[PDB]
């Protein structure tokens, strides 16, 4: 409902079965990461949706 | 003669002429309506007119003579400024008729009977790291106040750019007040190099336009312009 | 002379003026008419104007010549206040025009002819650990009242935090009130150095 702030760093909480790919544009550096940790995106890391 | 004057069968009086008090803001702008020497000691030619200040006199009083136009307040630059003198007044004490000088920071002077301001107190260009200016040499080598003492010619630019304190010079001109463009990695812009003509890709830090360099607008064909902003990811966005 | 006064056949009484009483907390501000010397011994200029404290007397009483033009107050600052003079008097007496010059904390002053203060009594800056300030050298090599004597040049910009209790020069102009964003880990801020362009 409330807009989120654009600054502040894109956080995805990824559940210990789930599991998300981002895309390091910057470097081309492609990781996927799974586990209780929360993903935070660099300056051109981006979701696969 | 200070005190009750008592004038003389051959002389009529017609009024008592005010000393002007003179101080350090203000001066007396008056010509001369006859050939005299002043109380300074100096001769002065008929129409030549000449400033009264402090340093001569704290309270001169118009002489029957000098003619006062008016009284001149000072033109008191700040550190932060700068002031265009055209006709300014040469060594030999006559005006240099046509030309004009630049007068920095922190200089409190008078105007000269013939000097004007051109655009009055002007501000000094301070410029920043990511600010810049793009100049003209309205004539032909400056090779002045130049840190490479680099002489453009007569009509070319140059940028001048970062933490410098640039009061432009009667030679130079202005053109456009130039920022640098911020771009990070993987990001920038199109410059189009007009002395050579060609049109490059410059990516990397934040580039700041040089003096013959104009931004170039990339015209992509119709239809692509409409899948680059539809298709952000076109492996979730494919249903349509 | 104090008493009952008898004017003379030669002499014709205006009136009496009265001695303006001065205080720590004023002062007196006159021009001068003619070229004479006032009391304290030394001569002045005509159209010269000067200040009369209590260090000089107690009560003055405005001379035929001077003409006093009013009352200064005190121009007092806390410890916590600077000020900025408009045209401040240097070593010579006269004013310095077009300059600037900063008042520290805990100094009370008096406004000298032709002194004003630039916005009044200003605020010092005082900043936290998180709370901070950007700058703008108006002019260049300041190198003065820094830590590290550290000198910018003309135009840029630094960055002064922690607990400082800062003052701007004369030189330098405060751009924007900085604070420091609160983050813990796993959060945080996309910052863009310009300087850099990353």
Redesign the interface.
């Given at each position: 409902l409330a807009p989120r702030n654009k600054?502040?760093?894109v956080?995805y909480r990824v559940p210990h079965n789930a599991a998300v790919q981002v895309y390091d544009?910057?470097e081309k550096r492609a990781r996927v990461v799974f586990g209780p940790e929360?993903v935070?995106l660099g300056?051109?890391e981006?979701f696969?949706? | 003669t200070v005190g009750a004057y008592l004038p003389a069968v051959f002389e009529e009086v017609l009024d008592l002429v005010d000393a002007v008090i003179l101080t350090e803001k203000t001066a007396l702008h008056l010509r001369a309506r006859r050939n005299f020497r002043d109380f300074r000691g100096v001769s002065r030619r008929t129409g030549e007119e000449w400033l009264v200040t402090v340093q001569d006199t704290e309270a001169h009083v118009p002489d029957v003579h000098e003619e006062v136009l008016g009284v001149v307040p000072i033109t008191t630059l700040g550190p932060h400024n700068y002031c265009v003198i055209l006709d300014p007044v040469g060594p030999d004490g006559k005006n240099q008729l046509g030309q004009k000088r630049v007068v920095k920071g922190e200089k409190s002077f008078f105007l000269q009977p013939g000097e004007q301001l051109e655009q009055g107190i002007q501000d000094v260009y301070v410029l920043s790291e990511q600010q810049g200016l793009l100049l003209r040499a309205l004539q032909p080598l400056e090779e002045g106040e130049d840190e490479e003492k680099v002489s453009h010619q007569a009509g070319d630019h140059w940028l001048i750019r970062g933490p410098l304190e640039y009061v432009p010079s009667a030679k130079v001109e202005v053109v456009e007040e130039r920022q640098a463009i911020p771009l990070d990695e993987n990001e920038g812009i199109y410059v189009q190099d007009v002395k050579t003509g060609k049109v490059r890709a410059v990516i990397g830090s934040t580039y700041m336009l040089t003096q013959d360099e104009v931004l170039w607008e990339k015209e992509l064909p119709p239809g692509v312009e409409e899948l680059l902003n539809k298709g952000q990811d076109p492996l979730a966005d494919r249903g349509e």
């Open positions: 600054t502040r760093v956080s544009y910057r929360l935070s300056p051109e981006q696969t949706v | -």
